[PDB]
Design a protein around this ligand. Structure first.
Ligand SMILES: Nc1ncnc2c1ncn2[C@@H]1O[C@H](COP(=O)(O)OP(=O)(O)O)[C@@H](O)[C@H]1O
Ligand SMILES: Nc1ncnc2c1ncn2[C@@H]1O[C@H](COP(=O)(O)OP(=O)(O)O)[C@@H](O)[C@H]1O
Ligand code: BEF
Ligand code: BEF
Lengths: 9, 111, 623, 621, 111
């Protein structure tokens, strides 16, 4: 339920 | 003749005031419906202290108390109307130089 | 028996080793302590001179100074304050845990325009963190000069002075250690002063050649009443505080009274800074000033994570501080600061809403924070939804609000309809809305990935629930004639439903008839309990999700049928003629797959669909 | 003229107010302070009873006690330590910044192995945080039993007590406040002791009736070559309250200016809370002299190693005055490096148990794949810790170092294909030619593999080369290259014709070398986003909407020059420039190949409409 | 005839020791290639502190200074071989009950 965006580039 | 520094905090049913005079003698603590008075004789210099505080809101003093510990004179006032929050101790908005808030036992009971 | 009575004492040899070695961890706040002491002195003299204006006869310009002299390797702090006599020297600088500031403030009239920094009594002895033997010069108005030379070695030698007259005020002279010489530069001194004591009320001047290059040219405007400041001086203060080259977008000025009191300023930047959701080690936006001295900036308790974009200043008068004067005691207090900041930021947004000229500028940059707060914040989920603008069918290019949709809603609708997709052109032309748009009812487009998270926690609005148009039951406000029409169509289309079910085993739970298509053939929908069709595409690309729950709450697909398309109308006759025809068993699968592509689903090994298409291309090419 | 010399002083009332009010933030550490004093006394007497074993004649059991008494509010703490005479009472309990513990520990003979938990000199007066009138009964072996009493008001009385005997040992008797009665419940005191002061070497007994609070003796203070795995399991189960035995364990020590001991446990099953809480990193604790100091403050352990549980102990660190945090924050930059360097070797000796490594890598692979992305220094050590599926492996995962050993003599790169499942990438159209020549393809199906590959770029000198990117170079024969050249020399008209047909969706139409059966695929450019990376970067929900238009894939169509359909299409293309069937078939083929390549097709309703229209012709409607 | 407290740390080219002996009288600081010796008579208690420290590695004594002060006696030794990190002061691994490490100037110079 957690937004797990991972910093990309 | 000078006032004695104090600290105060409150709970859902009682207002607590703790004075700071070490090794007090013959303290005369007297409550009133809208006023508080305090006249001690303490310290090493045998100086005289006197604190006259106008209470912010009516309270019942018959169930009040105090406990003259050799470190501090811890008063405890019984709130007249349960649940009534107090924003400040004294009627007049002008800040008193010797009155603070005891943030160690301060608690947001209104939760 | 007998009782002996004694008196507590103090080990004045270890009591200073504690104050120097242990209390203070940062070897930079010595300048802040000295500056604060100078400010106390200046406030003392300024308040005393309010009665007899002749006290300034020995000196008129109240000020502070800093004169680093590398040749002598001393950091002089010239001053023009109250000073202090010999008895005051011996009873204020030689007594650990004794401060004349508190005793002075306790002996002044009830209510005055003065507020002093420092009550503990150990601040000065922090000057031996980065210095050798100290030397203090002083001159009161009731005495002569007295040099004060100590080195924190159990001694302090007041003596008579014969040097140059100072007129009125102290002159501290440190002696920096050999390795700590790096505080005589322009850069280091400027950085320390700007970081710690920028908002001191008196001018500070760094005499280094001689060029009086003042370091304190900005002033604290949060103390002044808001009605006095113009909407342009806020811009100058924002530009100076943040180094931004554009004015602020919105501003809020409020104060709170009670057992906890503070003032605050809140600026909403013009354009959101890049890399906003990356820095997890430092956010330092809502600074905390106590009596105009820096305290801390990095504590999540000050403001929730989803309000990261707000940048401002919060000033308080009488908060409790740790003995180092760097950390806030009673870390349970911050639950009131957060609760008082959030409900004021939301009022700032509410008042910014009624100016629909720059609300586009605000929204285009700060929509994601709102749509994330709706997902996380469980208390403001009511007031945080009315600030949402969504593209709808009956709008075109201009965004509209939910409270406008409810105002334009039909008298017979009992819910709000919405559809989730990838873009706007894809969503508008989709097969699901073909009957909703035909009846006349509006639709809400949700073309953002965060919208799924926003609508999981949203369940209704103004008493009306959000029902999707890609779920099982889409109860249109249907007329009674279409009930019997549906009964006829259902009773006329069973055999085809079971035949399609027996060919589509283990793929679709149950094949039914449709009530949401007008022109397009069969479309695929999902079930209520479980992720929608679009949310799977998101949750299968999060890259930080456990793999055990994918197969548990995936979906339940349900094929449908449009009872008017010739492709199915002739298919029913062909099925009734011979229910085991091969062409039917190929056409039904091809139709299922090409309907599956319509929805936001994905197949497994699409090569089996590419080959199906290639074979029937070869059929048409005559090869 | 004259120089007057004086000496410093100290105001007692202000110092007491300071110590009581503005030193300690948690009112619950008085119990750990008194327990530390009790253990100090016990260590004193235990060391004293070595040379002259007659000291233990007045009592021979070493212990601690706690006796809450709710009828009249007290909280006893009975000991059996060295005790204190009258001079010790007067010159230790009445001086603020004087500590007899430091003076005693400055007179150790040469190297006696005794460690005391008090240096500062203040901390007894933390009892007045919750106590109204402390009473200290005491009895040394030299001077008789005295009673001590103070309300912390600049006065304290040293009585002479004729009461009940104790034999040998102090006895603190607090007098708790009116609203501080909460410290008499069994549960509250049990929890406070368990959290703060659990790992002390002497029994603690709460008389409620002798439920010793600390049954688990510490084991990190013993030589690791003397511990069996059963003891490690029985300590793990007590430390983490787990019903499942551990999987791996490390026991290392560091010598020098900064010294510490450490244990490291790897749990068998991954908790379902990883990457979720992001509030408290309480996995690794910090102990100093076997007393709780602080949990992991962020920089102790990097994010990608969040699953490690363990304990760190030390004998000398610069603690704050509150003994709740370190003073210098530069220690947590060397401790981090040491712990990471030890974990990245624990993994290495875990690797050689191939039957056991699978149980680890099946649950803790995302952490390694994230460390490859974030740990810019340890890529060469997190690279050999990966296992991947390949075409020539079946159901047995293999490592990259096993792949490199199976490499052909003419190979010059490592091939890899990425998608969303193994079933798709197994049968995709890209590998149809690479698999034909007997080359080994590496599969990558997890989403985190996109971030892993984007930062590796190398292995053992080989460079990772994808199969969905333009410019794939396969070892070709002299006949093969000339055949491809003549094929390109006979398919320029069709290539430019269909380029004219589209002109917007693709920027080139070339001749293939990686297709065998599929007539046409689509490959992106070499400077941009891969086909699957684009599909991943549209589901983050928190991203920059602008940057997609500047760093985007640049498509590049392709054609198999031998498949029958395109060979027949060339005839109609050269015969007629604008035949309807041709200009429909090219669009249909482009969209069909666009779907098969994993691209998010734009406006799929048109592609659906084409099929719905051309099925009717099959049915003749 | 008892040892005096101390604190020590090092840098790239120098070693630092700080003998915390307040009000030092008759200070006899003596360097050597492999041994150190300190002898003071300070404070009111009027003991004669003596420190007998064995050095870890060869150091240059003719480039070493001590800066006496009313609060300590800071010794600054010259390292023998540039860059050789010192893990401990004394030769023997056994702990010295007084000598600690001054963590307020400790730095990771060999980063
Ligand atoms: N430059 C100065 N000018 C005037 N008074 C000073 C100056 N520096 C220090 N003092 C006085 O000396 C005392 C400062 O001692 P200190 O230990 O720093 O305590 P505090 O910071 O709590 O005031 C106070 O009484 C203050 O008024
Ligand atoms: N129960 C006890 N038994 C023996 N000595 C005790 C006991 N409680 C306190 N002491 C003594 O009192 C002193 C502790 O005082 P305190 O202010 O807590 O300082 P510190 O914690 O730094 O030792 C020491 O001399 C210690 O030996
Ligand atoms: F530096 Be002091 F506390 F004013
Ligand atoms: F309570 Be002390 F620090 F031993």
């Amino acid at each position: 339920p957690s937004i797990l965006e991972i910093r990309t580039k | 003749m000078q006032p004695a520094s104090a600290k105060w905090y409150d709970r859902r049913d009682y207002v607590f005031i703790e004075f700071c005079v070490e090794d007090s003698k013959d303290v005369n603590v007297n409550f009133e419906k809208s006023k508080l008075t305090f006249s001690c004789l303490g310290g090493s210099d045998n100086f005289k202290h006197l604190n006259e505080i106008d209470l912010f809101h009516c309270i019942d003093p018959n169930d009040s108390k105090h406990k003259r510990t050799d470190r501090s004179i811890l008063c405890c006032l019984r709130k007249g109307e349960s649940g009534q929050s107090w924003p400040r101790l004294t009627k007049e908005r002008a800040k008193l130089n010797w009155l603070s808030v005891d943030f160690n036992n301060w608690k947001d009971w209104e939760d | 028996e007998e009782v002996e009575t004694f008196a507590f004492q103090a080990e004045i040899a270890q009591l200073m080793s504690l104050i120097i070695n242990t209390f203070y961890s940062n070897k930079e706040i010595f300048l802040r302590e000295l500056i604060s002491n100078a400010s106390d002195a200046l406030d003392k003299i300024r308040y005393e001179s309010l009665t007899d204006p002749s006290k300034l006869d020995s000196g008129k310009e109240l000020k502070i100074d800093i004169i680093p002299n590398p040749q002598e390797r001393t950091l002089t702090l010239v001053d023009t304050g109250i000073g202090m006599t010999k008895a005051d020297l011996i009873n204020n600088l030689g007594t650990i845990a004794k401060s004349g500031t508190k005793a002075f403030m306790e002996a002044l009239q009830a209510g005055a325009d003065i507020s002093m920094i420092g009550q503990f009594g150990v601040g000065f002895y922090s000057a031996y963190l980065v210095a050798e033997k100290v030397v203090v010069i002083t001159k009161h108005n009731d005495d002569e000069q007295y040099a004060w030379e100590s080195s924190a070695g159990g001694s302090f030698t007041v003596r008579a002075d014969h040097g140059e007259p100072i007129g009125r005020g102290t002159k501290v002279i440190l002696h920096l250690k050999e390795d700590q010489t790096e505080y005589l530069e322009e850069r280091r001194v400027k950085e320390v002063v700007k970081k710690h004591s920028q908002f001191i009320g008196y001018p500070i001047t760094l005499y280094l050649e001689i060029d009086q290059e003042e370091l304190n040219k900005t002033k604290p405007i949060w103390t002044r009443n808001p009605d006095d400041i113009t909407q342009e001086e806020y811009g100058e203060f924002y530009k100076s505080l943040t180094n931004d080259w554009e004015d602020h977008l919105a501003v809020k000025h409020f104060s709170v009274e009670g057992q906890l009191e503070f003032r605050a300023l809140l600026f909403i930047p013009r354009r959101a800074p890049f890399d906003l959701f990356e820095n997890k080690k430092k956010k330092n936006n809502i600074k905390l000033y106590v009596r105009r001295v820096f305290i801390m900036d990095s504590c999540d308790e000050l403001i929730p994570e989803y309000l990261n974009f707000i940048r401002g200043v919060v000033d308080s008068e009488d908060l409790p501080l740790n003995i180092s004067r760097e950390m806030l005691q009673q870390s349970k207090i911050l639950k009131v600061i957060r609760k008082n900041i959030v409900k004021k930021c939301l009022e700032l947004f509410s008042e910014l809403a009624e100016d629909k000229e720059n609300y586009k500028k605000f929204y285009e940059a700060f929509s994601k924070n709102l749509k994330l707060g709706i997902h996380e914040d469980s208390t403001n989920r009511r007031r945080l939804s009315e600030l949402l603008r969504y593209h709808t069918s009956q709008s075109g290019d201009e965004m509209t609000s939910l409270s406008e949709y409810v105002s334009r809603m039909k008298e017979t609708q009992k819910s709000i309809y919405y559809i989730t997709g990838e873009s706007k052109e894809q969503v508008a032309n989709s097969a699901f809305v073909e009957r909703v748009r035909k009846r006349g009812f509006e639709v809400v487009y949700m073309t953002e990935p965060i919208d799924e998270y926003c609508v999981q926690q949203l369940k209704e609005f103004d008493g009306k629930s959000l029902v999707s148009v890609t779920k099982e039951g889409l109860e249109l406000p249907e007329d009674e004639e279409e009930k019997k029409k549906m009964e006829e169509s259902k009773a006329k289309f069973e055999n085809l439903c079971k035949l399609m079910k027996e060919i589509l085993d283990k793929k679709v739970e149950k094949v039914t008839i449709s009530n949401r298509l007008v022109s397009s053939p069969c479309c695929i929908v999902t079930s209520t309990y479980g992720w929608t069709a679009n949310m799977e595409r998101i949750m299968k690309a999060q890259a930080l999700r456990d793999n055990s729950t994918m197969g548990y709450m995936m979906a339940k697909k349900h094929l449908e049928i449009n009872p008017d398309h010739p492709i199915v109308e002739t298919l029913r006759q062909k099925a009734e003629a011979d229910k085991n025809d091969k062409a039917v068993k190929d056409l039904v699968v091809l139709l299922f797959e090409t309907a599956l592509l319509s929805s936001g689903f994905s197949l497994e090994d699409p090569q089996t669909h590419s080959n199906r298409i290639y074979r029937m291309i070869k059929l048409g090419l005559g090869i």
